[PDB]
Amino acid sequence: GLGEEDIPREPRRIVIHRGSTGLGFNIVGGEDGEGIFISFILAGGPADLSGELRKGDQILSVNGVDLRNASHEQAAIALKNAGQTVTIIAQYKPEEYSRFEA
Protein backbone atom coordinates (compact mmCIF):
# COMPACT_ATOMS: atom_id res chain seq x y z
CA GLY A 1 0.00 0.00 0.00
CA LEU A 2 0.93 3.70 0.05
CA GLY A 3 4.22 4.13 1.90
CA GLU A 4 5.08 0.44 2.03
CA GLU A 5 7.70 0.96 -0.72
CA ASP A 6 9.23 4.14 0.76
CA ILE A 7 12.97 3.85 1.10
CA PRO A 8 13.79 3.61 4.79
CA ARG A 9 16.63 5.73 6.03
CA GLU A 10 18.22 4.88 9.32
CA PRO A 11 17.35 7.25 12.16
CA ARG A 12 20.39 9.46 13.05
CA ARG A 13 21.43 11.16 16.32
CA ILE A 14 22.21 14.88 15.96
CA VAL A 15 23.50 16.88 18.93
CA ILE A 16 22.79 20.64 18.65
CA HIS A 17 24.15 23.31 20.97
CA ARG A 18 21.52 26.00 21.43
CA GLY A 19 22.39 29.46 20.20
CA SER A 20 21.06 32.86 20.99
CA THR A 21 17.71 32.38 19.21
CA GLY A 22 17.22 28.63 19.45
CA LEU A 23 18.36 25.53 17.59
CA GLY A 24 18.22 27.06 14.15
CA PHE A 25 15.35 25.27 12.47
CA ASN A 26 11.55 25.31 12.31
CA ILE A 27 8.99 22.53 12.31
CA VAL A 28 5.65 21.69 10.77
CA GLY A 29 3.25 18.79 11.43
CA GLY A 30 1.95 17.28 14.64
CA GLU A 31 -1.63 17.08 13.40
CA ASP A 32 -3.79 14.62 11.44
CA GLY A 33 -1.19 11.86 11.76
CA GLU A 34 1.68 13.94 10.36
CA GLY A 35 4.77 13.78 12.51
CA ILE A 36 7.09 16.65 13.36
CA PHE A 37 9.07 17.62 10.27
CA ILE A 38 11.88 20.10 9.83
CA SER A 39 10.63 22.71 7.38
CA PHE A 40 13.34 25.39 7.57
CA ILE A 41 17.02 25.65 8.45
CA LEU A 42 18.16 29.11 9.57
CA ALA A 43 21.24 30.27 7.73
CA GLY A 44 24.17 30.40 10.13
CA GLY A 45 22.27 28.89 13.03
CA PRO A 46 23.19 25.86 15.07
CA ALA A 47 21.46 23.30 12.90
CA ASP A 48 22.99 24.81 9.77
CA LEU A 49 26.52 24.86 11.15
CA SER A 50 26.10 21.24 12.22
CA GLY A 51 25.34 20.31 8.59
CA GLU A 52 23.31 17.24 9.50
CA LEU A 53 19.66 18.22 9.78
CA ARG A 54 17.63 18.95 6.69
CA LYS A 55 14.18 19.75 5.46
CA GLY A 56 12.15 16.59 5.41
CA ASP A 57 13.72 15.09 8.52
CA GLN A 58 11.11 13.86 10.95
CA ILE A 59 12.08 14.50 14.54
CA LEU A 60 11.44 11.26 16.37
CA SER A 61 12.63 12.34 19.81
CA VAL A 62 14.26 15.22 21.69
CA ASN A 63 16.41 14.25 24.66
CA GLY A 64 14.70 10.86 24.61
CA VAL A 65 11.21 12.42 24.68
CA ASP A 66 9.16 10.67 22.02
CA LEU A 67 7.66 13.08 19.51
CA ARG A 68 6.37 10.54 16.97
CA ASN A 69 2.75 11.38 17.84
CA ALA A 70 3.27 14.66 19.59
CA SER A 71 1.30 17.75 18.81
CA HIS A 72 3.03 20.73 17.25
CA GLU A 73 2.82 22.58 20.57
CA GLN A 74 4.23 19.62 22.48
CA ALA A 75 7.17 19.43 20.08
CA ALA A 76 7.86 23.17 20.38
CA ILE A 77 7.73 22.91 24.19
CA ALA A 78 10.08 19.94 24.14
CA LEU A 79 12.53 21.86 22.00
CA LYS A 80 12.23 24.95 24.24
CA ASN A 81 12.82 22.93 27.40
CA ALA A 82 15.60 20.65 26.10
CA GLY A 83 18.45 22.68 27.62
CA GLN A 84 21.68 23.93 26.13
CA THR A 85 22.77 20.63 24.54
CA VAL A 86 19.93 18.97 22.65
CA THR A 87 19.95 15.39 21.39
CA ILE A 88 17.69 14.96 18.38
CA ILE A 89 16.88 11.63 16.78
CA ALA A 90 15.78 12.40 13.24
CA GLN A 91 14.86 10.26 10.26
CA TYR A 92 14.93 11.59 6.71
CA LYS A 93 11.49 10.86 5.25
CA PRO A 94 11.34 12.78 1.96
CA GLU A 95 8.46 10.82 0.46
CA GLU A 96 6.20 11.55 3.45
CA TYR A 97 7.34 15.13 3.73
CA SER A 98 6.41 15.66 0.10
CA ARG A 99 2.97 14.12 0.58
CA PHE A 100 2.23 16.42 3.51
CA GLU A 101 3.66 19.60 1.98
CA ALA A 102 1.26 19.40 -1.03
Side-chain angles (χ1 to χ4, degrees), residues 1 3-102:
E4 193 151 18
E5 300 164 24
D6 288 357
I7 295 160
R9 286 136 189 123
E10 290 210 309
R12 287 126 53 223
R13 175 173 164 274
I14 300 105
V15 176
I16 301 302
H17 295 270
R18 190 181 304 270
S20 161
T21 61
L23 304 171
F25 59 87
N26 208 357
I27 53 164
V28 292
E31 193 181 336
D32 291 2
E34 180 181 1
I36 301 300
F37 282 89
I38 294 185
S39 53
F40 167 82
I41 303 286
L42 176 75
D48 183 32
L49 297 168
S50 165
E52 274 152 25
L53 294 168
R54 63 193 291 188
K55 290 187 22 203
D57 277 333
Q58 184 180 344
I59 296 178
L60 308 181
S61 59
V62 172
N63 290 3
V65 176
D66 185 7
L67 296 180
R68 294 180 174 70
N69 307 299
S71 70
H72 192 270
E73 182 177 359
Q74 283 160 359
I77 294 333
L79 294 174
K80 166 86 194 74
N81 297 342
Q84 288 313 108
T85 304
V86 180
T87 299
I88 292 167
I89 306 288
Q91 180 184 341
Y92 185 50
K93 296 171 77 170
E95 300 99 335
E96 272 201 342
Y97 184 71
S98 176
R99 291 160 186 144
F100 289 123
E101 279 299 290

Coordinates of all heavy atoms in Angstrom, one line a residue, unseen atoms left out:
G1 N 0.8 -1.2 0.0 CA 0.0 0.0 0.0 C 0.8 1.3 0.0 O 2.1 1.2 -0.1
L2 N 0.2 2.4 0.1 CA 0.9 3.7 0.0 C 1.9 3.8 1.2 O 1.5 3.7 2.4 CB 0.0 4.9 0.1
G3 N 3.2 4.0 0.9 CA 4.2 4.1 1.9 C 5.0 2.9 2.2 O 6.1 2.9 2.7
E4 N 4.4 1.7 1.8 CA 5.1 0.4 2.0 C 6.4 0.3 1.3 O 7.3 -0.4 1.7 CB 4.2 -0.7 1.6 CG 4.6 -2.0 2.2 CD 3.5 -3.0 2.4 OE1 2.4 -2.8 1.9 OE2 3.7 -4.0 3.2
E5 N 6.5 1.0 0.1 CA 7.7 1.0 -0.7 C 8.6 2.2 -0.5 O 9.5 2.4 -1.3 CB 7.3 0.8 -2.2 CG 6.5 -0.4 -2.5 CD 5.8 -0.4 -3.9 OE1 6.3 0.4 -4.7 OE2 4.8 -1.1 -4.0
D6 N 8.3 3.0 0.5 CA 9.2 4.1 0.8 C 10.6 3.6 1.1 O 10.7 2.5 1.7 CB 8.7 4.9 1.9 CG 7.5 5.8 1.6 OD1 7.0 5.8 0.5 OD2 7.0 6.4 2.6
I7 N 11.6 4.3 0.8 CA 13.0 3.8 1.1 C 13.3 4.2 2.5 O 13.2 5.4 2.9 CB 14.0 4.5 0.2 CG1 13.8 3.9 -1.2 CG2 15.4 4.1 0.6 CD1 14.4 4.8 -2.3
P8 N 13.6 3.3 3.4 CA 13.8 3.6 4.8 C 15.2 4.1 5.0 O 16.2 3.5 4.5 CB 13.6 2.3 5.5 CG 13.8 1.2 4.5 CD 13.6 1.8 3.1
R9 N 15.3 5.2 5.6 CA 16.6 5.7 6.0 C 16.8 5.5 7.5 O 15.8 5.6 8.3 CB 16.7 7.2 5.6 CG 16.9 7.3 4.1 CD 16.1 8.4 3.5 NE 16.1 8.4 2.0 CZ 15.0 8.3 1.2 NH1 13.8 8.0 1.7 NH2 15.1 8.5 -0.1
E10 N 18.0 5.2 7.9 CA 18.2 4.9 9.3 C 18.1 6.1 10.1 O 18.5 7.2 9.7 CB 19.7 4.4 9.5 CG 20.0 3.0 8.8 CD 21.1 2.3 9.6 OE1 22.2 3.0 9.8 OE2 20.9 1.1 10.0
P11 N 17.4 6.1 11.3 CA 17.3 7.2 12.2 C 18.8 7.6 12.6 O 19.6 6.7 12.7 CB 16.5 6.8 13.4 CG 15.6 5.7 12.8 CD 16.5 5.0 11.8
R12 N 19.1 8.9 12.7 CA 20.4 9.5 13.1 C 20.3 10.2 14.3 O 19.2 10.8 14.6 CB 20.8 10.5 12.0 CG 21.3 9.9 10.7 CD 20.4 10.6 9.6 NE 20.5 12.0 9.6 CZ 19.4 12.8 9.4 NH1 18.2 12.3 9.2 NH2 19.6 14.1 9.4
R13 N 21.4 10.3 15.1 CA 21.4 11.2 16.3 C 22.2 12.4 16.0 O 23.3 12.3 15.5 CB 22.1 10.4 17.5 CG 22.3 11.3 18.7 CD 22.7 10.3 19.8 NE 23.3 11.0 21.0 CZ 24.6 11.4 21.1 NH1 25.4 11.2 20.1 NH2 25.0 12.0 22.2
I14 N 21.6 13.6 16.2 CA 22.2 14.9 16.0 C 22.2 15.6 17.3 O 21.2 15.9 17.8 CB 21.4 15.6 14.9 CG1 21.4 14.8 13.6 CG2 22.0 17.0 14.6 CD1 20.1 14.2 13.3
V15 N 23.4 16.1 17.7 CA 23.5 16.9 18.9 C 23.7 18.3 18.5 O 24.6 18.6 17.7 CB 24.7 16.4 19.8 CG1 24.8 17.3 21.0 CG2 24.5 14.9 20.2
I16 N 22.8 19.2 19.0 CA 22.8 20.6 18.6 C 23.0 21.4 19.9 O 22.4 21.1 21.0 CB 21.4 21.0 18.0 CG1 21.1 20.3 16.8 CG2 21.4 22.6 17.8 CD1 22.2 20.4 15.6
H17 N 23.9 22.4 19.9 CA 24.1 23.3 21.0 C 23.3 24.6 20.7 O 23.5 25.2 19.6 CB 25.6 23.6 21.0 CG 26.5 22.4 21.4 ND1 26.8 22.1 22.7 CD2 27.0 21.4 20.6 CE1 27.4 21.0 22.7 NE2 27.6 20.5 21.5
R18 N 22.4 24.9 21.6 CA 21.5 26.0 21.4 C 22.3 27.3 21.3 O 23.3 27.5 22.0 CB 20.6 26.1 22.7 CG 19.4 27.0 22.5 CD 18.5 27.2 23.7 NE 18.0 25.8 24.1 CZ 16.9 25.3 23.7 NH1 16.1 26.0 22.9 NH2 16.7 24.0 24.0
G19 N 21.8 28.1 20.4 CA 22.4 29.5 20.2 C 21.5 30.5 20.8 O 20.6 30.2 21.5
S20 N 21.7 31.7 20.4 CA 21.1 32.9 21.0 C 19.6 32.9 20.7 O 18.8 33.4 21.5 CB 21.7 34.2 20.6 OG 20.7 35.2 20.8
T21 N 19.1 32.4 19.5 CA 17.7 32.4 19.2 C 17.0 31.0 19.2 O 15.8 30.9 19.0 CB 17.4 33.0 17.9 OG1 18.1 32.3 16.8 CG2 18.0 34.5 17.9
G22 N 17.8 30.0 19.5 CA 17.2 28.6 19.4 C 18.2 27.7 18.8 O 19.4 27.8 18.8
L23 N 17.6 26.6 18.2 CA 18.4 25.5 17.6 C 18.6 25.7 16.1 O 19.3 25.0 15.5 CB 17.6 24.2 17.8 CG 17.4 23.9 19.3 CD1 16.5 22.7 19.6 CD2 18.7 23.7 20.1
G24 N 17.9 26.7 15.5 CA 18.2 27.1 14.1 C 17.4 26.3 13.1 O 17.8 26.1 12.0
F25 N 16.2 25.9 13.5 CA 15.3 25.3 12.5 C 13.9 25.6 12.8 O 13.6 26.1 13.9 CB 15.6 23.8 12.3 CG 15.4 23.0 13.6 CD1 14.1 22.5 13.9 CD2 16.4 22.6 14.4 CE1 13.9 21.7 15.0 CE2 16.2 21.9 15.6 CZ 14.9 21.4 15.8
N26 N 13.0 25.3 12.0 CA 11.6 25.3 12.3 C 10.9 24.0 11.9 O 11.5 23.2 11.2 CB 10.9 26.5 11.7 CG 9.7 27.0 12.5 OD1 9.3 26.4 13.5 ND2 9.1 28.1 12.1
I27 N 9.7 23.8 12.5 CA 9.0 22.5 12.3 C 7.6 22.8 11.9 O 6.9 23.8 12.2 CB 9.0 21.7 13.6 CG1 8.5 22.5 14.8 CG2 10.4 21.1 13.8 CD1 8.2 21.7 16.0
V28 N 7.0 21.8 11.2 CA 5.6 21.7 10.8 C 5.1 20.3 11.2 O 5.9 19.5 11.7 CB 5.5 21.9 9.3 CG1 5.8 23.3 8.8 CG2 6.3 20.8 8.5
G29 N 3.8 20.1 11.1 CA 3.3 18.8 11.4 C 2.7 18.8 12.9 O 2.4 19.8 13.5
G30 N 2.5 17.5 13.3 CA 2.0 17.3 14.6 C 0.4 17.3 14.7 O -0.2 17.5 15.7
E31 N -0.2 17.1 13.5 CA -1.6 17.1 13.4 C -2.0 16.1 12.3 O -1.3 15.9 11.4 CB -2.1 18.5 13.1 CG -3.7 18.7 13.3 CD -4.2 20.1 12.9 OE1 -3.4 21.0 13.0 OE2 -5.4 20.3 12.7
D32 N -3.2 15.5 12.5 CA -3.8 14.6 11.4 C -2.9 13.5 11.1 O -2.8 13.0 9.9 CB -4.1 15.4 10.2 CG -5.2 16.4 10.3 OD1 -5.8 16.6 11.4 OD2 -5.6 17.1 9.3
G33 N -2.1 13.0 12.0 CA -1.2 11.9 11.8 C 0.1 12.2 11.2 O 1.0 11.4 11.0
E34 N 0.4 13.5 10.8 CA 1.7 13.9 10.4 C 2.6 14.1 11.6 O 2.2 14.8 12.5 CB 1.5 15.3 9.6 CG 2.8 15.8 9.1 CD 2.7 17.1 8.3 OE1 1.6 17.7 8.2 OE2 3.8 17.6 7.9
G35 N 3.8 13.6 11.5 CA 4.8 13.8 12.5 C 5.4 15.2 12.4 O 4.9 16.1 11.7
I36 N 6.4 15.4 13.2 CA 7.1 16.6 13.4 C 8.2 16.7 12.3 O 9.2 15.9 12.4 CB 7.7 16.8 14.8 CG1 6.6 16.7 15.8 CG2 8.4 18.1 14.9 CD1 5.5 17.7 15.7
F37 N 8.1 17.5 11.3 CA 9.1 17.6 10.3 C 9.8 19.0 10.3 O 9.2 20.0 10.5 CB 8.4 17.5 8.9 CG 8.0 16.1 8.5 CD1 6.8 15.5 8.9 CD2 8.9 15.3 7.9 CE1 6.5 14.3 8.5 CE2 8.6 14.0 7.6 CZ 7.4 13.5 7.9
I38 N 11.1 18.9 10.0 CA 11.9 20.1 9.8 C 11.5 20.7 8.5 O 11.5 20.1 7.5 CB 13.4 19.8 9.9 CG1 13.7 19.3 11.3 CG2 14.2 21.0 9.4 CD1 15.2 19.0 11.5
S39 N 11.1 22.0 8.6 CA 10.6 22.7 7.4 C 11.5 23.8 7.0 O 11.3 24.4 5.9 CB 9.3 23.3 7.6 OG 9.3 24.1 8.8
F40 N 12.6 24.2 7.7 CA 13.3 25.4 7.6 C 14.6 25.2 8.4 O 14.5 24.8 9.5 CB 12.5 26.6 8.1 CG 13.3 27.9 8.2 CD1 13.5 28.7 7.1 CD2 13.7 28.3 9.5 CE1 14.3 29.9 7.3 CE2 14.5 29.4 9.6 CZ 14.7 30.2 8.5
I41 N 15.7 25.6 7.8 CA 17.0 25.7 8.5 C 17.5 27.1 8.4 O 17.6 27.7 7.3 CB 18.1 24.7 7.8 CG1 17.6 23.3 7.7 CG2 19.4 24.9 8.5 CD1 17.6 22.6 9.0
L42 N 17.7 27.7 9.5 CA 18.2 29.1 9.6 C 19.6 29.2 9.1 O 20.5 28.6 9.7 CB 18.0 29.6 11.0 CG 18.4 31.0 11.4 CD1 17.4 32.0 10.8 CD2 18.6 31.2 12.9
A43 N 19.9 30.1 8.2 CA 21.2 30.3 7.7 C 22.1 30.8 8.9 O 21.8 31.7 9.5 CB 21.3 31.3 6.6
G44 N 23.2 30.1 9.1 CA 24.2 30.4 10.1 C 23.8 30.0 11.5 O 24.6 30.2 12.5
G45 N 22.7 29.3 11.7 CA 22.3 28.9 13.0 C 22.8 27.5 13.4 O 23.6 26.9 12.6
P46 N 22.5 27.1 14.6 CA 23.2 25.9 15.1 C 22.9 24.7 14.2 O 23.9 23.9 13.9 CB 22.7 25.7 16.5 CG 22.2 27.1 16.9 CD 21.8 27.8 15.6
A47 N 21.7 24.5 13.7 CA 21.5 23.3 12.9 C 22.2 23.4 11.6 O 22.7 22.4 11.0 CB 19.9 23.2 12.7
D48 N 22.3 24.6 11.0 CA 23.0 24.8 9.8 C 24.5 24.5 9.9 O 25.0 23.8 9.1 CB 22.8 26.3 9.3 CG 23.4 26.6 8.0 OD1 23.5 25.7 7.2 OD2 23.8 27.8 7.8
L49 N 25.1 25.1 11.0 CA 26.5 24.9 11.1 C 26.8 23.4 11.4 O 27.9 22.9 11.1 CB 27.0 25.8 12.3 CG 26.9 27.3 12.0 CD1 27.1 28.1 13.3 CD2 27.8 27.7 10.9
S50 N 25.9 22.7 12.0 CA 26.1 21.2 12.2 C 26.1 20.5 10.9 O 26.9 19.5 10.8 CB 24.9 20.8 13.1 OG 24.8 19.4 13.2
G51 N 25.3 20.9 9.9 CA 25.3 20.3 8.6 C 24.6 19.0 8.4 O 24.6 18.4 7.4
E52 N 23.9 18.6 9.5 CA 23.3 17.2 9.5 C 21.8 17.3 9.3 O 21.3 16.5 8.5 CB 23.7 16.6 10.8 CG 25.1 16.0 10.6 CD 25.9 15.9 11.9 OE1 25.3 15.9 13.0 OE2 27.1 15.8 11.8
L53 N 21.1 18.2 9.9 CA 19.7 18.2 9.8 C 19.2 18.8 8.5 O 19.9 19.7 7.9 CB 19.1 19.0 10.9 CG 19.2 18.5 12.3 CD1 18.8 19.5 13.3 CD2 18.3 17.2 12.5
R54 N 18.1 18.4 8.0 CA 17.6 19.0 6.7 C 16.1 19.0 6.6 O 15.5 18.2 7.4 CB 18.2 18.1 5.5 CG 17.8 16.7 5.6 CD 18.6 15.8 4.6 NE 18.3 16.1 3.3 CZ 18.7 15.4 2.2 NH1 19.5 14.4 2.4 NH2 18.4 15.7 1.0
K55 N 15.6 19.8 5.7 CA 14.2 19.8 5.5 C 13.8 18.3 5.1 O 14.5 17.7 4.3 CB 13.8 20.7 4.4 CG 14.0 22.2 4.7 CD 13.5 23.2 3.7 CE 12.4 22.6 2.6 NZ 12.4 23.4 1.3
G56 N 12.6 17.9 5.6 CA 12.2 16.6 5.4 C 12.6 15.6 6.4 O 12.1 14.4 6.3
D57 N 13.5 15.9 7.3 CA 13.7 15.1 8.5 C 12.5 15.1 9.4 O 11.9 16.2 9.7 CB 14.9 15.7 9.3 CG 16.2 15.2 8.8 OD1 16.3 14.2 8.2 OD2 17.2 15.9 9.1
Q58 N 12.0 13.9 9.8 CA 11.1 13.9 10.9 C 11.9 13.7 12.3 O 12.8 13.0 12.4 CB 10.2 12.7 10.8 CG 9.1 12.7 11.9 CD 8.1 11.5 11.7 OE1 8.0 10.9 10.7 NE2 7.5 11.2 12.8
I59 N 11.5 14.6 13.2 CA 12.1 14.5 14.5 C 11.3 13.4 15.3 O 10.1 13.6 15.6 CB 12.0 15.9 15.3 CG1 12.9 16.9 14.5 CG2 12.5 15.7 16.7 CD1 12.8 18.3 15.1
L60 N 12.0 12.4 15.6 CA 11.4 11.3 16.4 C 11.5 11.5 17.9 O 10.6 11.1 18.6 CB 12.1 9.9 16.0 CG 12.2 9.6 14.5 CD1 12.9 8.3 14.3 CD2 10.9 9.6 13.8
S61 N 12.6 12.1 18.4 CA 12.6 12.3 19.8 C 13.6 13.5 20.0 O 14.4 13.8 19.2 CB 13.1 11.1 20.6 OG 14.4 10.7 20.2
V62 N 13.4 14.1 21.2 CA 14.3 15.2 21.7 C 14.6 14.9 23.1 O 13.8 14.7 24.0 CB 13.5 16.6 21.7 CG1 14.4 17.6 22.3 CG2 13.2 17.0 20.3
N63 N 15.9 14.6 23.3 CA 16.4 14.2 24.7 C 15.7 13.0 25.2 O 15.4 12.9 26.4 CB 16.3 15.4 25.7 CG 17.3 16.5 25.4 OD1 18.0 16.5 24.4 ND2 17.3 17.5 26.3
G64 N 15.4 12.1 24.3 CA 14.7 10.9 24.6 C 13.2 11.0 24.7 O 12.5 10.0 24.9
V65 N 12.6 12.2 24.6 CA 11.2 12.4 24.7 C 10.6 12.1 23.3 O 11.0 12.7 22.3 CB 10.9 13.9 25.1 CG1 9.4 14.1 25.0 CG2 11.5 14.2 26.4
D66 N 9.7 11.1 23.3 CA 9.2 10.7 22.0 C 8.2 11.7 21.4 O 7.3 12.2 22.1 CB 8.4 9.4 22.3 CG 7.8 8.7 21.1 OD1 8.1 9.1 19.9 OD2 7.0 7.7 21.3
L67 N 8.5 12.1 20.2 CA 7.7 13.1 19.5 C 7.0 12.5 18.3 O 6.4 13.2 17.5 CB 8.5 14.3 19.1 CG 9.0 15.1 20.2 CD1 9.8 16.3 19.6 CD2 8.0 15.6 21.1
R68 N 7.0 11.2 18.2 CA 6.4 10.5 17.0 C 4.9 10.9 16.8 O 4.4 11.1 15.7 CB 6.6 9.0 17.0 CG 8.1 8.7 17.0 CD 8.3 7.2 17.0 NE 9.7 6.8 16.8 CZ 10.7 7.0 17.7 NH1 10.5 7.7 18.8 NH2 11.9 6.5 17.5
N69 N 4.2 11.1 17.9 CA 2.8 11.4 17.8 C 2.4 12.6 18.6 O 1.3 12.9 18.9 CB 1.9 10.2 18.3 CG 2.2 8.9 17.7 OD1 2.1 8.8 16.5 ND2 2.8 8.0 18.5
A70 N 3.4 13.5 18.8 CA 3.3 14.7 19.6 C 2.6 15.7 18.8 O 2.7 15.7 17.5 CB 4.6 15.2 20.0
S71 N 1.9 16.6 19.5 CA 1.3 17.7 18.8 C 2.4 18.8 18.5 O 3.5 18.7 19.0 CB 0.3 18.4 19.7 OG 1.0 19.0 20.8
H72 N 2.1 19.7 17.6 CA 3.0 20.7 17.3 C 3.5 21.5 18.5 O 4.7 21.8 18.7 CB 2.4 21.6 16.2 CG 3.4 22.6 15.6 ND1 3.6 23.8 16.1 CD2 4.2 22.4 14.5 CE1 4.5 24.4 15.3 NE2 4.9 23.6 14.3
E73 N 2.5 21.8 19.4 CA 2.8 22.6 20.6 C 3.7 21.7 21.5 O 4.7 22.2 22.1 CB 1.5 23.0 21.3 CG 1.8 23.9 22.5 CD 0.6 24.4 23.2 OE1 -0.6 24.1 22.7 OE2 0.7 25.1 24.2
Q74 N 3.4 20.5 21.6 CA 4.2 19.6 22.5 C 5.7 19.6 22.0 O 6.6 19.5 22.8 CB 3.7 18.2 22.5 CG 2.5 18.1 23.5 CD 1.6 16.9 23.3 OE1 1.8 16.1 22.4 NE2 0.5 16.9 24.0
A75 N 5.8 19.5 20.6 CA 7.2 19.4 20.1 C 7.9 20.7 20.3 O 9.1 20.7 20.7 CB 7.1 19.2 18.6
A76 N 7.2 21.9 20.1 CA 7.9 23.2 20.4 C 8.3 23.3 21.8 O 9.3 23.8 22.1 CB 6.9 24.3 20.0
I77 N 7.4 22.9 22.8 CA 7.7 22.9 24.2 C 8.9 22.0 24.5 O 9.8 22.4 25.2 CB 6.5 22.5 25.0 CG1 5.3 23.5 24.9 CG2 6.9 22.2 26.4 CD1 5.8 24.9 24.6
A78 N 8.9 20.8 23.9 CA 10.1 19.9 24.1 C 11.4 20.6 23.7 O 12.4 20.5 24.3 CB 9.8 18.6 23.5
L79 N 11.3 21.2 22.5 CA 12.5 21.9 22.0 C 12.9 23.0 22.9 O 14.1 23.3 23.1 CB 12.3 22.3 20.6 CG 12.1 21.2 19.5 CD1 11.8 21.8 18.2 CD2 13.4 20.4 19.4
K80 N 11.9 23.8 23.4 CA 12.2 24.9 24.2 C 12.9 24.5 25.5 O 13.7 25.2 26.1 CB 11.0 25.8 24.5 CG 11.0 26.8 25.6 CD 11.5 28.1 25.1 CE 11.9 29.1 26.2 NZ 13.2 28.7 27.0
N81 N 12.4 23.4 26.1 CA 12.8 22.9 27.4 C 14.0 21.9 27.4 O 14.4 21.4 28.5 CB 11.6 22.4 28.2 CG 10.5 23.4 28.4 OD1 10.8 24.6 28.3 ND2 9.4 22.9 28.8
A82 N 14.6 21.7 26.2 CA 15.6 20.7 26.1 C 17.0 21.1 26.6 O 17.9 20.3 26.6 CB 15.7 20.2 24.6
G83 N 17.2 22.3 27.1 CA 18.4 22.7 27.6 C 19.4 23.2 26.6 O 19.0 23.5 25.4
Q84 N 20.7 23.4 27.0 CA 21.7 23.9 26.1 C 22.2 22.9 25.1 O 22.6 23.3 24.0 CB 22.8 24.5 27.0 CG 22.4 25.8 27.7 CD 21.7 26.7 26.8 OE1 20.5 26.9 26.9 NE2 22.5 27.3 25.8
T85 N 22.3 21.6 25.5 CA 22.8 20.6 24.5 C 21.6 19.7 24.3 O 21.1 19.0 25.2 CB 24.0 19.9 25.1 OG1 25.0 20.9 25.4 CG2 24.6 19.0 24.1
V86 N 21.2 19.6 23.0 CA 19.9 19.0 22.6 C 20.2 17.8 21.8 O 20.9 17.9 20.7 CB 19.0 20.0 21.9 CG1 17.7 19.3 21.5 CG2 18.8 21.1 22.9
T87 N 19.8 16.6 22.2 CA 20.0 15.4 21.4 C 18.7 15.1 20.6 O 17.7 14.8 21.2 CB 20.3 14.3 22.3 OG1 21.5 14.6 23.0 CG2 20.4 13.0 21.6
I88 N 18.8 15.2 19.3 CA 17.7 15.0 18.4 C 17.9 13.6 17.7 O 19.0 13.3 17.2 CB 17.6 16.1 17.3 CG1 17.2 17.4 18.0 CG2 16.6 15.8 16.2 CD1 17.4 18.6 17.2
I89 N 16.9 12.8 17.7 CA 16.9 11.6 16.8 C 16.0 12.0 15.6 O 14.8 12.3 15.8 CB 16.4 10.3 17.5 CG1 17.2 10.1 18.7 CG2 16.4 9.2 16.5 CD1 18.6 9.7 18.5
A90 N 16.5 12.0 14.4 CA 15.8 12.4 13.2 C 15.9 11.3 12.2 O 16.9 10.5 12.2 CB 16.4 13.7 12.7
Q91 N 14.9 11.2 11.3 CA 14.9 10.3 10.3 C 14.4 11.0 9.0 O 13.4 11.6 9.0 CB 13.9 9.1 10.6 CG 13.9 8.1 9.6 CD 12.9 7.0 9.9 OE1 12.4 6.7 11.0 NE2 12.4 6.3 8.8
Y92 N 15.2 10.9 7.9 CA 14.9 11.6 6.7 C 13.8 10.8 6.0 O 14.0 9.6 5.7 CB 16.2 11.7 5.9 CG 16.0 12.5 4.6 CD1 15.4 13.8 4.6 CD2 16.5 12.0 3.4 CE1 15.3 14.5 3.5 CE2 16.3 12.8 2.3 CZ 15.7 14.0 2.3 OH 15.5 14.7 1.2
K93 N 12.7 11.5 5.8 CA 11.5 10.9 5.2 C 11.0 11.7 4.1 O 9.9 12.3 4.2 CB 10.4 10.6 6.3 CG 10.9 9.6 7.4 CD 10.0 9.4 8.5 CE 8.8 8.6 8.3 NZ 8.2 8.4 9.6
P94 N 11.7 11.8 3.0 CA 11.3 12.8 2.0 C 10.0 12.5 1.3 O 9.3 13.4 0.9 CB 12.5 12.7 1.0 CG 13.2 11.3 1.2 CD 13.0 11.1 2.7
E95 N 9.7 11.2 1.1 CA 8.5 10.8 0.5 C 7.3 11.3 1.3 O 6.4 11.9 0.7 CB 8.4 9.3 0.3 CG 9.4 8.6 -0.5 CD 10.5 8.0 0.3 OE1 10.7 8.4 1.5 OE2 11.1 7.0 -0.2
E96 N 7.3 11.1 2.6 CA 6.2 11.5 3.5 C 6.2 13.1 3.5 O 5.1 13.7 3.4 CB 6.4 11.1 4.9 CG 5.9 9.8 5.2 CD 5.6 9.5 6.6 OE1 6.2 10.1 7.6 OE2 4.9 8.5 6.9
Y97 N 7.3 13.7 3.7 CA 7.3 15.1 3.7 C 6.7 15.7 2.5 O 5.9 16.6 2.6 CB 8.8 15.6 3.9 CG 8.9 17.1 4.0 CD1 8.5 17.7 5.2 CD2 9.3 17.9 3.0 CE1 8.6 19.1 5.4 CE2 9.5 19.3 3.2 CZ 9.0 19.9 4.3 OH 9.1 21.3 4.5
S98 N 7.0 15.2 1.3 CA 6.4 15.7 0.1 C 4.9 15.5 0.1 O 4.2 16.3 -0.4 CB 7.0 14.9 -1.1 OG 6.4 15.3 -2.3
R99 N 4.4 14.3 0.6 CA 3.0 14.1 0.6 C 2.2 15.1 1.5 O 1.1 15.5 1.2 CB 2.6 12.7 1.0 CG 3.1 11.7 0.0 CD 3.2 10.3 0.7 NE 3.8 9.3 -0.3 CZ 4.6 8.3 0.1 NH1 5.0 8.1 1.4 NH2 5.0 7.4 -0.8
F100 N 2.9 15.5 2.6 CA 2.2 16.4 3.5 C 2.4 17.9 3.1 O 1.6 18.7 3.6 CB 2.8 16.2 4.9 CG 2.4 15.0 5.6 CD1 3.4 14.1 6.0 CD2 1.1 14.7 5.8 CE1 3.0 12.9 6.6 CE2 0.7 13.5 6.4 CZ 1.7 12.6 6.8
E101 N 3.5 18.2 2.4 CA 3.7 19.6 2.0 C 2.9 20.0 0.7 O 3.0 21.1 0.3 CB 5.1 19.8 1.7 CG 5.9 20.1 3.0 CD 5.5 21.3 3.8 OE1 5.7 22.4 3.3 OE2 4.9 21.1 4.9
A102 N 2.1 19.1 0.1 CA 1.3 19.4 -1.0 C -0.1 19.9 -0.6 O -0.3 20.6 0.4 CB 1.1 18.1 -1.9

